[PDB]
Ligand binder design. Structure first.
Ligand SMILES: C[C@@H](c1cc[n+]([C@@H]2O[C@H](COP(=O)(O)OP(=O)(O)OC[C@H]3O[C@@H](n4cnc5c(N)ncnc54)[C@H](O)[C@@H]3O)[C@@H](O)[C@H]2O)cc1)N(C)C(=O)NCC(F)(F)F
Ligand SMILES: C[C@@H](c1cc[n+]([C@@H]2O[C@H](COP(=O)(O)OP(=O)(O)OC[C@H]3O[C@@H](n4cnc5c(N)ncnc54)[C@H](O)[C@@H]3O)[C@@H](O)[C@H]2O)cc1)N(C)C(=O)NCC(F)(F)F
Lengths: 140, 140
């Protein structure tokens, strides 16, 4: 069972999510990211179970990464689904801030607004090694 | 003197450029990327000497990466300057294609049009390990 689940937006967080995966693996964590670890079967169940199995939930907040969650009240968006699972299991949620702008909570569905209450790590292009070192300290 | 110089657009290729630097270092290449290796002094001289000293010139072609090169006839754009230096020194130029759209050569200053005649590597988010292995094949 992986220690770290990486949740991210394909169109904006793909490279950072992969960079995060490489570094965390180098530091000894088993990492789930979809393109390498989501395998055969009904992905609805597999994704949710993969969130549940991982102690750490690393959320890549690229610019606009929560836009598709807004008014997604029937819970069809996958970042939304992953956050709600992580929240309801009391996971160690570690947001990674990469040009994300903090929205008013009321623009998000009520079941995921608590994600903004978790302490986030600002990603620094100039000081990436120090950013990674901080992420590792936040990890459990 | 680094083996590999990575040229990239900050607003669109920072994450891929950083991800390439990690992978290439893990496979034994010394890498120049500006935020890690550009140190003290007048940066115009140091950047050009770094291109000149590195056998391999890896160019991150993220979307729009050459836009600022267009009509830069005074050669003030830094990606434009690095490419012309690479072409003038006959470096092994390895373009990495990440959502880049191939322009008609005439929209680029004539002293860098030859960059598009080099064989490029399509970045695959699903098969990153395979992509990295191909890149390492291209390197000298
Ligand atoms: C469904 C898809 C998927 C979606 C979301 N998330 C979780 O949500 C975050 C990303 O969210 P988001 O950026 O919004 O992605 P989304 O735009 O919604 O869909 C992306 C593309 O999947 C294509 N596609 C649609 N249907 C299928 C399908 N049946 N099979 C394969 N592709 C499908 C469609 O072409 C769409 O364009 C991440 O945290 C990730 O963990 C995980 C997975 N999926 C199952 C998938 O990829 N499998 C490939 C794998 F390599 F990832 F395993
Ligand atoms: C000048 C800058 C620099 C520019 C370009 N390139 C090479 O060209 C490609 C990137 O091209 P490009 O994306 O177009 O960057 P550009 O927009 O033009 O400038 C980006 C930001 O530099 C800021 N800034 C301006 N003036 C200075 C200055 N005196 N000092 C520090 N910052 C300065 C300004 O804030 C601007 O916004 C890459 O391949 C890279 O190799 C390399 C370097 N620079 C010297 C720099 O960063 N030093 C920090 C370091 F960590 F990178 F070393």
């Amino acid at each position: 069972t992986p220690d770290v689940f990486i949740s991210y937006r394909r169109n904006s967080g793909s490279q950072l999510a992969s960079l995060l995966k490489v570094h965390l693996q180098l530091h000894g964590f088993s990492v789930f990211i979809d393109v390498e670890k989501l395998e055969a079967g009904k992905f609805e169940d597999k994704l949710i179970q993969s969130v549940m199995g991982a102690r750490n939930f690393v959320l890549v907040l690229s610019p606009g990464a929560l836009d598709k969650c807004m008014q997604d009240h029937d819970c069809k968006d996958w970042v939304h689904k992953e956050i709600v699972t992580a929240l309801s299991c009391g996971k160690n949620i570690v947001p990674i801030i990469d040009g994300f702008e903090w929205p008013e909570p009321q623009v998000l569905p009520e079941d995921m607004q608590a994600v903004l209450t978790f302490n986030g790590i600002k990603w620094s292009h100039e000081y990436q090694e120090a950013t990674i070192e901080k992420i590792i300290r936040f990890l459990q």
